[PDB]
Amino acid sequence: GQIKFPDGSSIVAHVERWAKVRGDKLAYRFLDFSTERDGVPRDLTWAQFSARNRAVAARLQQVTQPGDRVAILCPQNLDYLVAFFGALYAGRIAVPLFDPSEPGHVGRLHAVLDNCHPSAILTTTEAAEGVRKFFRTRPANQRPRVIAVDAVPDDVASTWVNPDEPDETTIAYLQYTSRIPTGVQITHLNLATNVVQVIEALEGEEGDRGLSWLPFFHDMGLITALLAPMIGHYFTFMTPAAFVRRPERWIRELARKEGDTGGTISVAPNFAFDHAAARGVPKPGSPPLDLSNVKAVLNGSEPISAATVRRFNEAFGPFGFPPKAIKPSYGLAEATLFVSTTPSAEEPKIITVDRDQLNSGRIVEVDADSPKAVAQASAGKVGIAEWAVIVDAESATELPDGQVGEIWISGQNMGTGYWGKPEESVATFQNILKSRTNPSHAEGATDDATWVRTGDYGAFYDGDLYITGRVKDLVIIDGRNHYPQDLEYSAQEASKAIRTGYVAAFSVPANQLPDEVFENAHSGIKRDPDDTSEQLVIVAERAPDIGPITDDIRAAIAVRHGVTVRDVLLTAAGAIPRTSSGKIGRRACRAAYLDGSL
């Protein structure tokens, strides 16, 4: 009926079965935008695919003990996938990570390795010395063996032994998300379950194509690549760097290829759509572009702007892109990826709700032209055999539809906890819902089941799930609540000097505010060391005279919201702290303001 796999079932064997049936057929396709001019399809067949997995696994089994953790440090390549699957084949724990020769940020990776203590490192000959230099910075006591995956001979596959059948508790891999790092424990069960949850939600036919430029070290990027080998189908990808430079590459891959059966499926964050809108439109001397075939492009991992949807359809619509193609979706790493998505036959639902009531917790529609209106885009309906409920965090009781609360999630796809963090694991992953309500969005789930606290505010409305954002990023000032995305939207629209989606809004205790703020007359707050009250701060990058810019922002937010901005900090482009996925670190940006920067 609902996601019950037979006993003894395992992925290594499942992919191997497909590998025997699809033998000479294409498994993965990598588009190389490197020194070559434009595109180099690098292909890996099922036969090659299976062969390398077993070969790498054979070397892993000799050099690593079962239960040990295996880190994958590779740029985006076929070998990244050969390395991951190899870890599963060997029976070890994969730990997806990135190339330490990436533009800075490899100091953060020290911290991750500190959490899981990997016994071995998988990399490529290209990135190997970089990994060597990287680890030279760490003590010798922790220096795990490094294996170049492309360098391992195919003949080593001969000594491979299939690992023992997994149980309900067996950890498949550690998915790290974003002060100390948190690896989520994802079992083999979590992996197979969510893959099944996604495929049923996608309604994929046997003619569809699929593609992603997203990084594999990101949960949204990883499972998307892991989808294809379990369905039988092929999967084509490129590097994220390739997309940022020429977003037209992605659309061209989305566009109808000559003579295919089905539509294209992909996923990408909200900011990518805006990116693809400006720079991703083809030049006039390029061949014709037909986007009519696109089935579903999922938009997730960050709050989706109705503007981005309107802008994108406006841009690629004339090329035949359907409006029902954009599929807003919600999910997290604690679900390993997927929680809810917009149904496959449907248009994306974007609503507009009263601002003041939203800040009070109620979801109530209002006309879009109304002065207090905030656009809200649905994440659609919850995935199969998993449940999402709106709860009162303090009372652990299910709230009625239309009222905002913390989102709790439960399902077989949910992780078993955080690696090496026992206390936090219990508080987050083990919670029981003490009370249900009228149509109980938890219906179908056992009264005794554990719920995972997502840490996000949300609500249910007219059959769709809406995510209002994170509890941690909520801006409370002087007794009234503010959603930070709302403030920065009003801020960026105030001055054209502000790079778009470069803004971060937060609150700081008045006593902590810098001395400069109190010396500034235009602030409106004076310095009392005994004042612990939260004050609004807004930080924004300067797209390619502070005085007028700050005042416009101060005025616009003051008028639309009713809060006074105490400090507006303009930095150079790219200065604002971000994360792995490319999203703004809010609270991390706050810290960067308080510890001071440039």
Side-chain angles (χ1 to χ4, degrees), residues 175-177 182-187 190 194 219 330-339 386 411-418 428-429 452-456 470:
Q175 181 65 65
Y176 279 93
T177 55
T182 64
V184 179
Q185 303 177 293
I186 302 185
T187 67
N190 302 157
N194 198 258
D219 59 311
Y330 168 65
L332 64 169
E334 287 72 346
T336 83
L337 184 55
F338 165 74
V339 170
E386 51 181 330
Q412 200 174 111
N413 55 311
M414 302 306 161
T416 65
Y418 299 115
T428 299
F429 290 85
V452 183
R453 296 183 61 177
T454 218
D456 303 321
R470 259 192 170 290

mmCIF file of all heavy atoms in Angstrom, residues 175-178 182-187 190 194 219 330-339 386 409-418 428-429 452-456 470, unseen atoms left out:
data_model
loop_
_atom_site.group_PDB
_atom_site.id
_atom_site.type_symbol
_atom_site.label_atom_id
_atom_site.label_comp_id
_atom_site.label_asym_id
_atom_site.label_seq_id
_atom_site.Cartn_x
_atom_site.Cartn_y
_atom_site.Cartn_z
ATOM 1 N N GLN A 175 24.021 13.884 5.567
ATOM 2 C CA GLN A 175 23.721 15.098 4.820
ATOM 3 C C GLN A 175 23.886 16.309 5.721
ATOM 4 O O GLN A 175 23.104 16.525 6.645
ATOM 5 C CB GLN A 175 22.306 15.051 4.245
ATOM 6 C CG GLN A 175 21.917 16.275 3.422
ATOM 7 C CD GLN A 175 22.732 16.415 2.157
ATOM 8 O OE1 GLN A 175 22.647 15.582 1.255
ATOM 9 N NE2 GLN A 175 23.517 17.485 2.074
ATOM 10 N N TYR A 176 24.919 17.095 5.442
ATOM 11 C CA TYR A 176 25.226 18.272 6.236
ATOM 12 C C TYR A 176 24.467 19.500 5.763
ATOM 13 O O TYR A 176 24.435 19.795 4.570
ATOM 14 C CB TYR A 176 26.723 18.537 6.212
ATOM 15 C CG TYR A 176 27.466 17.675 7.199
ATOM 16 C CD1 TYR A 176 28.001 16.452 6.815
ATOM 17 C CD2 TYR A 176 27.615 18.072 8.520
ATOM 18 C CE1 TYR A 176 28.676 15.653 7.717
ATOM 19 C CE2 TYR A 176 28.289 17.283 9.427
ATOM 20 C CZ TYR A 176 28.814 16.073 9.022
ATOM 21 O OH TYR A 176 29.488 15.278 9.918
ATOM 22 N N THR A 177 23.822 20.178 6.711
ATOM 23 C CA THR A 177 23.092 21.409 6.430
ATOM 24 C C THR A 177 23.506 22.575 7.323
ATOM 25 O O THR A 177 24.171 22.386 8.345
ATOM 26 C CB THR A 177 21.598 21.205 6.615
ATOM 27 O OG1 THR A 177 21.358 20.700 7.935
ATOM 28 C CG2 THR A 177 21.077 20.224 5.598
ATOM 29 N N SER A 178 23.069 23.775 6.946
ATOM 30 C CA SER A 178 23.380 24.992 7.693
ATOM 31 C C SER A 178 22.189 25.407 8.554
ATOM 32 O O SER A 178 21.585 24.576 9.236
ATOM 33 C CB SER A 178 23.769 26.126 6.737
ATOM 34 N N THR A 182 25.845 20.534 11.581
ATOM 35 C CA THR A 182 24.935 19.425 11.842
ATOM 36 C C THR A 182 24.813 18.469 10.656
ATOM 37 O O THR A 182 24.166 18.796 9.660
ATOM 38 C CB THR A 182 23.537 19.958 12.191
ATOM 39 O OG1 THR A 182 23.000 20.658 11.062
ATOM 40 C CG2 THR A 182 23.604 20.906 13.393
ATOM 41 N N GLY A 183 25.421 17.294 10.758
ATOM 42 C CA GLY A 183 25.139 16.212 9.830
ATOM 43 C C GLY A 183 23.824 15.547 10.192
ATOM 44 O O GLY A 183 23.636 15.175 11.344
ATOM 45 N N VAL A 184 22.922 15.390 9.228
ATOM 46 C CA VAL A 184 21.697 14.613 9.430
ATOM 47 C C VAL A 184 21.954 13.147 9.106
ATOM 48 O O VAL A 184 22.604 12.837 8.110
ATOM 49 C CB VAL A 184 20.534 15.124 8.562
ATOM 50 C CG1 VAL A 184 19.289 14.278 8.781
ATOM 51 C CG2 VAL A 184 20.239 16.578 8.864
ATOM 52 N N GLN A 185 21.420 12.245 9.923
ATOM 53 C CA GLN A 185 21.623 10.826 9.680
ATOM 54 C C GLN A 185 20.524 10.315 8.778
ATOM 55 O O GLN A 185 19.365 10.227 9.178
ATOM 56 C CB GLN A 185 21.608 10.024 10.979
ATOM 57 C CG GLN A 185 22.592 10.435 12.029
ATOM 58 C CD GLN A 185 22.411 9.613 13.279
ATOM 59 O OE1 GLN A 185 21.398 9.724 13.962
ATOM 60 N NE2 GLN A 185 23.395 8.783 13.590
ATOM 61 N N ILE A 186 20.900 9.984 7.551
ATOM 62 C CA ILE A 186 19.962 9.461 6.572
ATOM 63 C C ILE A 186 20.239 7.980 6.350
ATOM 64 O O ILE A 186 21.335 7.586 5.948
ATOM 65 C CB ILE A 186 20.038 10.250 5.259
ATOM 66 C CG1 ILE A 186 19.741 11.725 5.561
ATOM 67 C CG2 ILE A 186 19.046 9.696 4.246
ATOM 68 C CD1 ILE A 186 19.648 12.636 4.349
ATOM 69 N N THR A 187 19.237 7.161 6.635
ATOM 70 C CA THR A 187 19.387 5.726 6.525
ATOM 71 C C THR A 187 19.181 5.314 5.077
ATOM 72 O O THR A 187 18.811 6.140 4.241
ATOM 73 C CB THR A 187 18.379 4.992 7.416
ATOM 74 O OG1 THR A 187 17.050 5.204 6.918
ATOM 75 C CG2 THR A 187 18.490 5.485 8.867
ATOM 76 N N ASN A 190 15.512 5.826 4.576
ATOM 77 C CA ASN A 190 15.160 7.207 4.289
ATOM 78 C C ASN A 190 15.387 7.524 2.818
ATOM 79 O O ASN A 190 14.596 8.224 2.185
ATOM 80 C CB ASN A 190 15.979 8.155 5.159
ATOM 81 C CG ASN A 190 15.799 7.898 6.638
ATOM 82 O OD1 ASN A 190 16.666 8.250 7.438
ATOM 83 N ND2 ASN A 190 14.672 7.293 7.014
ATOM 84 N N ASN A 194 12.087 8.300 0.245
ATOM 85 C CA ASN A 194 11.925 9.641 -0.291
ATOM 86 C C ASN A 194 12.041 9.612 -1.817
ATOM 87 O O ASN A 194 11.315 10.318 -2.518
ATOM 88 C CB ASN A 194 12.976 10.557 0.367
ATOM 89 C CG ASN A 194 12.654 12.050 0.228
ATOM 90 O OD1 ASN A 194 13.241 12.744 -0.603
ATOM 91 N ND2 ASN A 194 11.751 12.546 1.075
ATOM 92 N N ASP A 219 21.450 18.888 -0.514
ATOM 93 C CA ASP A 219 20.460 17.817 -0.434
ATOM 94 C C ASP A 219 19.549 17.842 -1.659
ATOM 95 O O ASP A 219 19.166 16.792 -2.172
ATOM 96 C CB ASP A 219 19.639 17.921 0.860
ATOM 97 C CG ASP A 219 18.904 19.236 0.990
ATOM 98 O OD1 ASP A 219 19.530 20.293 0.791
ATOM 99 O OD2 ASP A 219 17.710 19.212 1.351
ATOM 100 N N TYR A 330 8.461 22.447 -1.305
ATOM 101 C CA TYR A 330 9.084 22.633 -0.001
ATOM 102 C C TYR A 330 9.720 21.344 0.510
ATOM 103 O O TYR A 330 9.197 20.258 0.277
ATOM 104 C CB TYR A 330 8.046 23.121 1.001
ATOM 105 C CG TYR A 330 8.509 23.075 2.439
ATOM 106 C CD1 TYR A 330 9.549 23.879 2.882
ATOM 107 C CD2 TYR A 330 7.905 22.223 3.356
ATOM 108 C CE1 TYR A 330 9.970 23.838 4.197
ATOM 109 C CE2 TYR A 330 8.321 22.176 4.667
ATOM 110 C CZ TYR A 330 9.353 22.983 5.082
ATOM 111 O OH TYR A 330 9.769 22.939 6.391
ATOM 112 N N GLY A 331 10.854 21.459 1.191
ATOM 113 C CA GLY A 331 11.520 20.293 1.744
ATOM 114 C C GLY A 331 12.760 20.650 2.544
ATOM 115 O O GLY A 331 13.228 21.782 2.484
ATOM 116 N N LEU A 332 13.290 19.686 3.293
ATOM 117 C CA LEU A 332 14.509 19.893 4.078
ATOM 118 C C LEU A 332 15.336 18.610 4.146
ATOM 119 O O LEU A 332 14.882 17.550 3.723
ATOM 120 C CB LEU A 332 14.199 20.380 5.490
ATOM 121 C CG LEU A 332 13.419 19.487 6.443
ATOM 122 C CD1 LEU A 332 13.525 20.118 7.804
ATOM 123 C CD2 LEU A 332 11.960 19.311 6.033
ATOM 124 N N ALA A 333 16.529 18.706 4.724
ATOM 125 C CA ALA A 333 17.438 17.566 4.832
ATOM 126 C C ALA A 333 16.989 16.547 5.869
ATOM 127 O O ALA A 333 17.390 15.382 5.823
ATOM 128 C CB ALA A 333 18.817 18.042 5.166
ATOM 129 N N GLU A 334 16.180 16.987 6.821
ATOM 130 C CA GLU A 334 15.654 16.087 7.828
ATOM 131 C C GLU A 334 14.643 15.128 7.188
ATOM 132 O O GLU A 334 14.373 14.066 7.736
ATOM 133 C CB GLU A 334 15.034 16.880 8.977
ATOM 134 C CG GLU A 334 16.061 17.579 9.883
ATOM 135 C CD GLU A 334 16.759 18.791 9.247
ATOM 136 O OE1 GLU A 334 16.670 18.987 8.014
ATOM 137 O OE2 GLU A 334 17.405 19.559 9.995
ATOM 138 N N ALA A 335 14.071 15.512 6.050
ATOM 139 C CA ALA A 335 13.232 14.608 5.249
ATOM 140 C C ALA A 335 14.075 13.947 4.138
ATOM 141 O O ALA A 335 13.558 13.255 3.264
ATOM 142 C CB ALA A 335 12.059 15.367 4.656
ATOM 143 N N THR A 336 15.373 14.223 4.202
ATOM 144 C CA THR A 336 16.436 13.873 3.242
ATOM 145 C C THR A 336 16.347 14.684 1.964
ATOM 146 O O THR A 336 17.377 15.095 1.433
ATOM 147 C CB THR A 336 16.432 12.385 2.785
ATOM 148 O OG1 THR A 336 15.490 12.201 1.721
ATOM 149 C CG2 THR A 336 16.127 11.455 3.917
ATOM 150 N N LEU A 337 15.142 14.899 1.440
ATOM 151 C CA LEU A 337 14.884 16.052 0.600
ATOM 152 C C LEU A 337 13.454 16.567 0.732
ATOM 153 O O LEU A 337 13.184 17.638 1.269
ATOM 154 C CB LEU A 337 15.204 15.734 -0.854
ATOM 155 C CG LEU A 337 15.060 16.889 -1.836
ATOM 156 C CD1 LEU A 337 15.906 18.056 -1.373
ATOM 157 C CD2 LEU A 337 15.482 16.443 -3.219
ATOM 158 N N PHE A 338 12.550 15.730 0.221
ATOM 159 C CA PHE A 338 11.211 16.127 -0.221
ATOM 160 C C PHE A 338 10.081 15.963 0.789
ATOM 161 O O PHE A 338 9.897 14.891 1.368
ATOM 162 C CB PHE A 338 10.887 15.322 -1.487
ATOM 163 C CG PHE A 338 9.445 15.339 -1.880
ATOM 164 C CD1 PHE A 338 8.874 16.472 -2.439
ATOM 165 C CD2 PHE A 338 8.668 14.207 -1.731
ATOM 166 C CE1 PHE A 338 7.546 16.486 -2.819
ATOM 167 C CE2 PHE A 338 7.343 14.213 -2.109
ATOM 168 C CZ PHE A 338 6.780 15.356 -2.656
ATOM 169 N N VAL A 339 9.290 17.026 0.927
ATOM 170 C CA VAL A 339 8.132 17.052 1.815
ATOM 171 C C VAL A 339 6.836 17.266 1.024
ATOM 172 O O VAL A 339 5.934 16.432 1.086
ATOM 173 C CB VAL A 339 8.280 18.153 2.883
ATOM 174 C CG1 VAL A 339 6.979 18.334 3.655
ATOM 175 C CG2 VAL A 339 9.446 17.829 3.826
ATOM 176 N N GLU A 386 3.739 10.707 4.034
ATOM 177 C CA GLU A 386 4.418 11.582 4.984
ATOM 178 C C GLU A 386 3.429 12.668 5.393
ATOM 179 O O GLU A 386 2.514 12.994 4.634
ATOM 180 C CB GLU A 386 5.705 12.186 4.402
ATOM 181 C CG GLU A 386 5.568 12.858 3.038
ATOM 182 C CD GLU A 386 6.893 13.415 2.522
ATOM 183 O OE1 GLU A 386 7.744 13.795 3.352
ATOM 184 O OE2 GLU A 386 7.081 13.492 1.291
ATOM 185 N N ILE A 409 6.983 17.646 10.980
ATOM 186 C CA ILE A 409 6.945 16.640 9.925
ATOM 187 C C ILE A 409 7.170 15.251 10.504
ATOM 188 O O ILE A 409 7.908 15.087 11.474
ATOM 189 C CB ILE A 409 8.016 16.910 8.847
ATOM 190 N N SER A 410 6.525 14.254 9.910
ATOM 191 C CA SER A 410 6.696 12.870 10.332
ATOM 192 C C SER A 410 6.593 11.964 9.119
ATOM 193 O O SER A 410 5.793 12.212 8.219
ATOM 194 C CB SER A 410 5.652 12.477 11.381
ATOM 195 N N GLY A 411 7.399 10.911 9.100
ATOM 196 C CA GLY A 411 7.392 9.981 7.987
ATOM 197 C C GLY A 411 8.578 9.041 8.000
ATOM 198 O O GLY A 411 9.546 9.244 8.734
ATOM 199 N N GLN A 412 8.509 8.015 7.160
ATOM 200 C CA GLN A 412 9.568 7.020 7.098
ATOM 201 C C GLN A 412 10.820 7.557 6.426
ATOM 202 O O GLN A 412 11.886 6.946 6.498
ATOM 203 C CB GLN A 412 9.080 5.793 6.339
ATOM 204 C CG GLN A 412 9.881 4.547 6.601
ATOM 205 C CD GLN A 412 9.257 3.344 5.948
ATOM 206 O OE1 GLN A 412 9.809 2.788 5.000
ATOM 207 N NE2 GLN A 412 8.091 2.941 6.439
ATOM 208 N N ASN A 413 10.681 8.713 5.789
ATOM 209 C CA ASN A 413 11.797 9.364 5.121
ATOM 210 C C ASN A 413 12.588 10.263 6.063
ATOM 211 O O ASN A 413 13.630 10.801 5.691
ATOM 212 C CB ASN A 413 11.296 10.185 3.938
ATOM 213 C CG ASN A 413 10.243 11.188 4.342
ATOM 214 O OD1 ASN A 413 9.279 10.846 5.026
ATOM 215 N ND2 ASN A 413 10.439 12.442 3.960
ATOM 216 N N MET A 414 12.093 10.423 7.286
ATOM 217 C CA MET A 414 12.724 11.325 8.241
ATOM 218 C C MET A 414 14.004 10.737 8.819
ATOM 219 O O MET A 414 14.064 9.550 9.128
ATOM 220 C CB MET A 414 11.750 11.664 9.363
ATOM 221 C CG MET A 414 10.462 12.286 8.871
ATOM 222 S SD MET A 414 10.788 13.715 7.830
ATOM 223 C CE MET A 414 9.225 13.867 6.976
ATOM 224 N N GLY A 415 15.021 11.579 8.970
ATOM 225 C CA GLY A 415 16.310 11.123 9.454
ATOM 226 C C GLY A 415 16.217 10.659 10.885
ATOM 227 O O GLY A 415 15.240 10.949 11.564
ATOM 228 N N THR A 416 17.244 9.953 11.345
ATOM 229 C CA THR A 416 17.223 9.379 12.682
ATOM 230 C C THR A 416 17.876 10.291 13.725
ATOM 231 O O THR A 416 17.871 9.975 14.914
ATOM 232 C CB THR A 416 17.925 8.006 12.706
ATOM 233 O OG1 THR A 416 19.320 8.157 12.414
ATOM 234 C CG2 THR A 416 17.276 7.059 11.700
ATOM 235 N N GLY A 417 18.414 11.427 13.289
ATOM 236 C CA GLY A 417 19.051 12.366 14.197
ATOM 237 C C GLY A 417 20.249 13.064 13.591
ATOM 238 O O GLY A 417 20.535 12.905 12.408
ATOM 239 N N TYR A 418 20.951 13.842 14.405
ATOM 240 C CA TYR A 418 22.178 14.499 13.967
ATOM 241 C C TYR A 418 23.404 13.707 14.421
ATOM 242 O O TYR A 418 23.447 13.224 15.553
ATOM 243 C CB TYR A 418 22.245 15.928 14.504
ATOM 244 C CG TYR A 418 21.119 16.827 14.031
ATOM 245 C CD1 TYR A 418 20.197 17.344 14.933
ATOM 246 C CD2 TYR A 418 20.991 17.177 12.689
ATOM 247 C CE1 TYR A 418 19.171 18.180 14.515
ATOM 248 C CE2 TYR A 418 19.965 18.012 12.259
ATOM 249 C CZ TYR A 418 19.056 18.510 13.179
ATOM 250 O OH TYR A 418 18.032 19.343 12.774
ATOM 251 N N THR A 428 14.916 17.669 18.481
ATOM 252 C CA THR A 428 14.426 17.929 17.136
ATOM 253 C C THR A 428 13.646 16.761 16.520
ATOM 254 O O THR A 428 12.531 16.949 16.041
ATOM 255 C CB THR A 428 15.601 18.295 16.216
ATOM 256 O OG1 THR A 428 16.236 19.478 16.713
ATOM 257 C CG2 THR A 428 15.128 18.548 14.798
ATOM 258 N N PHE A 429 14.217 15.559 16.550
ATOM 259 C CA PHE A 429 13.650 14.442 15.797
ATOM 260 C C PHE A 429 12.629 13.614 16.571
ATOM 261 O O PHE A 429 11.847 12.875 15.971
ATOM 262 C CB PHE A 429 14.776 13.513 15.332
ATOM 263 C CG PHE A 429 15.653 14.099 14.256
ATOM 264 C CD1 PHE A 429 16.728 14.907 14.584
ATOM 265 C CD2 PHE A 429 15.418 13.824 12.922
ATOM 266 C CE1 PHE A 429 17.542 15.433 13.601
ATOM 267 C CE2 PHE A 429 16.231 14.355 11.936
ATOM 268 C CZ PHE A 429 17.294 15.157 12.279
ATOM 269 N N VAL A 452 9.212 15.524 13.558
ATOM 270 C CA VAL A 452 10.454 16.282 13.486
ATOM 271 C C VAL A 452 10.127 17.765 13.423
ATOM 272 O O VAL A 452 9.346 18.190 12.581
ATOM 273 C CB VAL A 452 11.310 15.876 12.265
ATOM 274 C CG1 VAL A 452 12.617 16.635 12.263
ATOM 275 C CG2 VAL A 452 11.585 14.384 12.271
ATOM 276 N N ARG A 453 10.713 18.548 14.325
ATOM 277 C CA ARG A 453 10.509 19.990 14.313
ATOM 278 C C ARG A 453 11.377 20.603 13.239
ATOM 279 O O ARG A 453 12.606 20.547 13.294
ATOM 280 C CB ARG A 453 10.837 20.615 15.663
ATOM 281 C CG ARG A 453 9.935 20.162 16.781
ATOM 282 C CD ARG A 453 10.269 20.882 18.075
ATOM 283 N NE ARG A 453 10.090 22.328 17.954
ATOM 284 C CZ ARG A 453 10.262 23.189 18.951
ATOM 285 N NH1 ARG A 453 10.598 22.749 20.158
ATOM 286 N NH2 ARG A 453 10.087 24.489 18.747
ATOM 287 N N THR A 454 10.715 21.219 12.273
ATOM 288 C CA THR A 454 11.375 21.695 11.078
ATOM 289 C C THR A 454 12.078 23.027 11.373
ATOM 290 O O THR A 454 13.120 23.337 10.792
ATOM 291 C CB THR A 454 10.340 21.804 9.924
ATOM 292 O OG1 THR A 454 10.933 21.397 8.687
ATOM 293 C CG2 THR A 454 9.779 23.192 9.786
ATOM 294 N N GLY A 455 11.507 23.796 12.297
ATOM 295 C CA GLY A 455 12.036 25.101 12.648
ATOM 296 C C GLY A 455 11.522 26.215 11.755
ATOM 297 O O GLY A 455 12.097 27.305 11.722
ATOM 298 N N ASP A 456 10.429 25.939 11.044
ATOM 299 C CA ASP A 456 9.828 26.876 10.096
ATOM 300 C C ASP A 456 8.401 27.193 10.500
ATOM 301 O O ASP A 456 7.659 26.313 10.930
ATOM 302 C CB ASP A 456 9.829 26.320 8.661
ATOM 303 C CG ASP A 456 11.214 25.950 8.163
ATOM 304 O OD1 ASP A 456 12.179 26.683 8.457
ATOM 305 O OD2 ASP A 456 11.333 24.919 7.466
ATOM 306 N N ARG A 470 11.357 31.149 8.524
ATOM 307 C CA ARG A 470 11.958 30.562 9.714
ATOM 308 C C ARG A 470 11.705 31.293 11.013
ATOM 309 O O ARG A 470 11.649 32.519 11.058
ATOM 310 C CB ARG A 470 13.470 30.455 9.535
ATOM 311 C CG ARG A 470 13.906 29.069 9.173
ATOM 312 C CD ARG A 470 15.406 28.879 9.264
ATOM 313 N NE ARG A 470 15.729 27.463 9.141
ATOM 314 C CZ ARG A 470 15.448 26.554 10.071
ATOM 315 N NH1 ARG A 470 14.850 26.917 11.201
ATOM 316 N NH2 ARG A 470 15.766 25.279 9.878
#
